[PDB]
Amino acid sequence: DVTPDDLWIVMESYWQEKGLVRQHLDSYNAFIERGLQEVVNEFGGIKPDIPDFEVKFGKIRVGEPEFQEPHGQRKPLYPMDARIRNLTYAAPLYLEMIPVIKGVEQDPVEVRIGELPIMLKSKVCRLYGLSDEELIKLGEDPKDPGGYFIINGSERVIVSIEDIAPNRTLVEKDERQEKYIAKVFSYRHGYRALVAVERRKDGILYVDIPNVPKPVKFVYVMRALGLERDKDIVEAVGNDPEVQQIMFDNLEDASDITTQQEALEFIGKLVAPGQAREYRLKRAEYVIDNNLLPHMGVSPEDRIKKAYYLGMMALKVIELSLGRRPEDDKDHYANKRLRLAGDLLKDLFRVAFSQLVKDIQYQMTKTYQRKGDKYTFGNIHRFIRNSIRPDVLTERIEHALATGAWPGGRTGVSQLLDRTNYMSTLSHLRRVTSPLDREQPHFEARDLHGTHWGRICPTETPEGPNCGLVKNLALMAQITTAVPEEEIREYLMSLGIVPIEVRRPDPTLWRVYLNGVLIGTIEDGKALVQRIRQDRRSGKISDVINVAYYEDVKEVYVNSDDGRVRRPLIIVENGVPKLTKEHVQAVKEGRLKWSDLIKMGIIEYLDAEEEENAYVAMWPWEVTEEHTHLELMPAAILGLPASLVPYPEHNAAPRNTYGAGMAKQSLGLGWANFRIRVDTRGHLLHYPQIPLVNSRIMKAVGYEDRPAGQNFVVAVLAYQGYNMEDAIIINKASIERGLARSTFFRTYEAEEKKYLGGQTDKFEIPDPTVRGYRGEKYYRNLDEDGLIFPESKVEGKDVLVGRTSPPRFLSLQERRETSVAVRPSEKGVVDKVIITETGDGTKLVKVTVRDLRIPELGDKFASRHGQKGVIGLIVPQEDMPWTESGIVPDLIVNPHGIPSRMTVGQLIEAIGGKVASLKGRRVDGTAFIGEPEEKLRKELEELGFKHTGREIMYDGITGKRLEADIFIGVIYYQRLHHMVADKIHARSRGPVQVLTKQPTEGRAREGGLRFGEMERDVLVGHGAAMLLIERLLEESDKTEVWVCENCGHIALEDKRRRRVYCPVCGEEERISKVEMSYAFKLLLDELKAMVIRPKLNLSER
């Protein structure tokens, strides 16, 4: 019999063979292979408005990642080259134009339609298939998983959107109007159409169609699709006596309409009021063709199947009305589908290619009109070639990927890749985001659904308004990719299904749905699902096919679409798992791989639909004949950062969430490539260490090669008042010996722009003549070429790159000083200087400044159990207490937060760390199979210490032992990137904003702190009127104006005549001085910008 360790041996092979970013790579590969051709075939070809001429599309292909040098030719491009040069890692797209003249094709011509950005490490990327010693020579980190885009030197990652499953009939209750509604989202060529059929209180069905003002009668719209016979309606909806009675009632209520043409004219009246009869008829038939369930087709022949689908929807509604079926429960996973990178990129390419074909057609029409005819027909090749505008496609694709603003209203799909450390990057590469609005409560959507088990991490979620709406895939999660639909349909047809066109859904007969559309009916559902399961396990069909049956409604569902989230499971047959010991041995020896286990029928992936029929056991020793599957590794249900916490089951859930969130913020050697990286911000821990108590998953995922913390000797004691309220106390000597010492990086950028008209910038030492010339003190560290010397120490606002710009016409014969300087409050040493050329050939200089960051007061430290704090005091070593066995704490924490936080796992890790450090080998801290507490307690006693982990210490000041035994151990602690050196900020006077004349915003530009209206209300509540006026007028904005008390209008002061006069009424006698905020004067001007006339009445005193 197998043991959990044997199952772990199999489990790690899955990550070894597949990786961690399969969801992006597989989707992008499928896109490149098929989606481009699909989108090209959708358009068919260009139809220019030229007599007897037409263009038909051919094949499309992707070249290689290249770059067209401005003063040169196309050359190979590499990701590190693109990162530094701010280029776009893209490959050209080649497409075949087939000219059709006189309705006859001829030899095709291949043209370049644009550039497509390349996902890193995809099958078309240059880094694919390379070894570690080659990636190193290319400047890449071998641990880099790839799966992101590089746009203008920035790393963009596409997160997966979590939409509702397409072509799904979901039924909900409209209790507000006491109705029942069924909703479907029909997709065709990216377009979405929400079609709904509802039953109101009257018991009459109505159908909602896009681009239709008011819901039409159900029988009327069905009549519009042919099938006018009343008996045909009754048979299409169903056969049940109550169903046919309700349909008799509806038909009696719908006896007003007679034929399909009358319904068409009625819809024409609905859609095109006031227009000609023929126009309304045609444009309503258009709506019927391509707005009513387009996924069934748009052909006029598609009437009957659309009618059958609508009838089944109506049957579902009325069945819900009778209580024969429950609600849809759209929170269930079967109704949810992920939008992967490939699908979104296909949509973007679709819209961009539509724009491109419009532009091409316009260009050819113009050329034929203006050049002539014999020119175009003489050289068709030139006429086609010199009319394509690839920049139209490239600009839109690049901008859409860079900004994150997506066509169709989607926003935030593409985010800047987080590069703080290893865990943050990998976690960012695996995210699922809900498309809902953050501001609304959404209590039903934010909740953790029961089906989330094994598909979404239960703990790794954001803290603020995004809580529950942003989620991360679990480790067992696998995302499917669609197989061809027609082959699956034919295979299902060959198994004995009769087409739906043959016989009606007799309740004696099961219904069969393929990806949500009814395709036929079978006599037995269970026999069909067993038959399909046997082929799927044997290997006759692809593994992506999932089949489930619902006994109550007699329906069989077959899923083969894209974007489902599944988990692997061991198949249990007759109470005996199909996985045997020799299979584990073969996996260990490398003879047998995970894919072989998949093909051997030992392990299969289950989506949400199929898992409804399953009964999975947790452990091998609790399997019986009833069970159908066995859990591979329960500890793998957690996400990637959540797996870091040792013994997570001993902590309260909020604390585990905090620890998992903070694990993505700590410093460490994120990547070995950091030295030549050009990231805006960066960090580097000087002495990273492997955690002594760790989960075996982290070694498999490669985290131990890039650790992000250190082991501290921690004593739980209330040393002073300096550690209360989650503050911590740290030893000075340990800090001086290299504990938590870190380095901070920041990269500055400077372009030598070339303006229109020939004027350009220049790198040089700014002469004293130029305007804006800052003090000579700040040019102390510049070379004659205008660049700073590396390894020279700089201070605040010191110039790194000297540069002058062409003057501004208010002066003349001047050069603006536009040097790039260090941020006003930063300090460090210049590390490296890089000179490159941009995409346009202009010089580009990047300078990185490194700064040592010794731990100080206010720096934030957090353990992985969610316990966080700041350094409250730095104590000399001789003041710290010492254990009678010769140990001095590296850190002291307050014993007060422990009971309230209920993080027993941290207390267990404290024992485990010292046990591991004393026995000479690390301790396994896996989630549910780690070394138990009782074993560690006995082992600690074996080594000579006390089993409670308490040691006798002597007070460091009085030199006598404390009264109570003190708990002391070793705990992994992480330094967070929230350092006080980046948060401190003070403004004396600073500059002011142009419009409101108030202090600027942010630390970078010497901004001022926000004094919110709540602070004003607090001031009022204290009754301090003069303090309020001082804070609100002098410190921010105040001015004096001239007010004419005769008419209230603000008077004009002329500095030419030293005179004040009122323009609106010509008054000079009574012009009093008024003191007010500048913002209120702006408000008065804004009101006078409208027709508002605010008159001002003055008063004395």
Place this chain on the structure above:
Amino acid sequence: MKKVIGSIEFGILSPQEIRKMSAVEVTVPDTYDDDGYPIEGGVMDKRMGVIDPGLRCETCGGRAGECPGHFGHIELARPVIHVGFAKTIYRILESTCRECGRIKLTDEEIEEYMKKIELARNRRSEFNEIIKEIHKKAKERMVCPHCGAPQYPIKFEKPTIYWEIRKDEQGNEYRHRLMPTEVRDWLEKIPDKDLPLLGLDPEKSRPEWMVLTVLPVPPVTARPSITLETGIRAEDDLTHKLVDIIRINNRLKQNIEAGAPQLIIEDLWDLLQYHVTTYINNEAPGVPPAKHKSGRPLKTLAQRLKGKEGRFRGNLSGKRVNFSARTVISPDPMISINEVGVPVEVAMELTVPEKVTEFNIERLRKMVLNGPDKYPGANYVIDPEGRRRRIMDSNKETLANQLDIGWTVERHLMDGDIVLFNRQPSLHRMSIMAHRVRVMPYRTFRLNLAVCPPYNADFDGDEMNLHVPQTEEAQAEARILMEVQNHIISPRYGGPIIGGIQDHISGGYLLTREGAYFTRDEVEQMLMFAGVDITELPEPDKYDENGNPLWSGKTIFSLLLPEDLTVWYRNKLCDEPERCEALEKLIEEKLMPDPEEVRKLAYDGFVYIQNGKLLSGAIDKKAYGREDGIILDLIVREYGVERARQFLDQVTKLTIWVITHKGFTTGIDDEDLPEEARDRIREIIREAEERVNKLIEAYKRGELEPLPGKSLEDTLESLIMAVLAEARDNAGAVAEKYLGMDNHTVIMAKTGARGKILNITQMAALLGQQSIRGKRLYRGFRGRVLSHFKPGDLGARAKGFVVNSYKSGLTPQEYFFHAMGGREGLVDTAVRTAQSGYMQRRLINALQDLKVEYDGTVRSPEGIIVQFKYGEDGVDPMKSWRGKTVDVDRIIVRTLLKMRG
């Protein structure tokens, strides 16, 4: 000399006013030429002002930072309807005759309604009701009473479309559209005598002004262009919209002059109307908002005045201020509660202007000599004439000798200065208080720990702002009203808000518990550390073996109390009521018991103090903790704020020293229950599970009794939950009883320093039921939460009951259920914060301006009396004795003990 704005009267700008107040007429749809100068006659003409450097506005001279701005105007080719007045225009049109322009009312009814209006129409709601009644009356008359003429109905189509349903031949209407010129002509002939009947005013407004023919142009300084880093001028949205408006107007004028077809002119008129209504309000209902080149919606005049980032709430009610600093906070128990530690880097950046006088000349001279780099230096000097000089190394001695009476020095911060110290969100009035500056070397603000509860701050990364008042009156206000020691008692419930927390309470319990004793060196060191000015130790309480003297904790603690304080009560450690009852009887029989008689009956659960001598009880959250503080509450009322501050500082330091040098820790063995307790807990859990199973079995065969009003399933769920809650409480009952007072976690929980019994019973015995929104977990597969259970299982374990503790570890199903439980709390806090904030904003705006007058009444700013006596008794809740208007028992008792002494 200087006057103030006494009142503001609103109205509608007339075309004459717009023309006269304007400085230039705009005719060119462009802003800047090729080189960069403003184009003459453009939307950026220099007549309106200058925004570019090195340019003089010809209207008023000035410069970029000096010229305030001047209004322009556009002569519209044809009138357009103002979008803000369209609904009012519709209201007016359907209530007046088309021919004579008079109100379609009868004269005696007009007289009655004019009499009604004059009866205090200033109340807006009543005026609106009267006007609505007039509108309804005038709607339903087809024929004018003043003149004989039929009136057709008018249909309003949003945003500014008016239809006239006028009949034609064969009795059929054709819904004639009313052009803006026709509407203006109709409105113009309305007499002034009946304008008040329409809600308007004959002077501040006119009906014909609501249809505008000339459009004012905002000044250039109100439309600041931003020179982008690429070198391209980034025009403001308003400027672009004005350019579009001018272009459309010019095209319309050219077409009208050229005799264009009627349809083209109508289309151009509609386009101009659309452009104007978008410029005034881009979020107007019924129109597609104009979009920028990037596709974003433009922001227009209506957008600037609305929203949290708009003018009113973003730049008027609140704004960014100078002389402010922000950094993280770190604990410091060694400073007084009314002091804040300030980094030396911040102190040399912020300055406090000070005037030179005869009593501070030498100190200011020394600071000026120190320069702007030594810590006690200065950055600027202001001569009496008002010129500003920056202190530099070449000017130190010369400026120091120039310094005399009447000069101003912008010195660095000092010890004893007053600053404003704030944490966001500012939920309540003691979120901002004034502190005394105390300079510090490092880069974090130091805050005393007893002041944390008012700020709701913990040292886990929180940042708090600091403000420096710049004027003497503001400094006096901060010093007198906003001192920290003034706000010890919370105004919400009349109890202390500042008090000992966590280690303070724990150390107090350790010091005052029974059996605590200290040696000579410990007593001397702790008294010196606390700051007590003692010069002679009291008599030893007991003598240890080897002849060493020992002092009890009661004697040491009694040295901090006022000499004549007397009080008795019951603390949270009371467990045997007979012991407390005996002490209460002994005190009641004679109001002054013999101390040597009390010491025989001394019990930790009953605190009793006699003339400053602590005779019984132990320190607890009731002693000086913020919520239940009594000693602090008595001291602050009977001895003033300063004595309370001294007492608080001394007790905090003493308790911190005690907890430091006695040793206080918690470990993995604090939840080590004996085997019998584990067996008892397992027995309880099994009994509860069996009861739940029996209930489910009874339900499945229809034998369950349906509870009143509920469905049978709901009755089953409620009974199951009651059983499970009872089971968890029963487990906690033994978990508490087996962990004695000697456990440090139990000490932390019972004294109220941190945590409660629920945490202990969850860590040691049982987690119990997990539920979402008050009901058991159901949001899984069909009939089951997890696929690891059989469908239809209603058992306790299968629905969320977790039988393990945090110590023993959770099985994966229990872990998933616990995560389900925690997510609800997270989202609950996330939503509740925003809801509470919005409700508080509504309340603040409702009740802001009420105040207590000199006569004791609370009056609205309009003079309306809200209360004839504030709080109906006249007592400030902050000064009240815990809600009570006055504590009679305390006064009688203290008077009797004072006089019987």
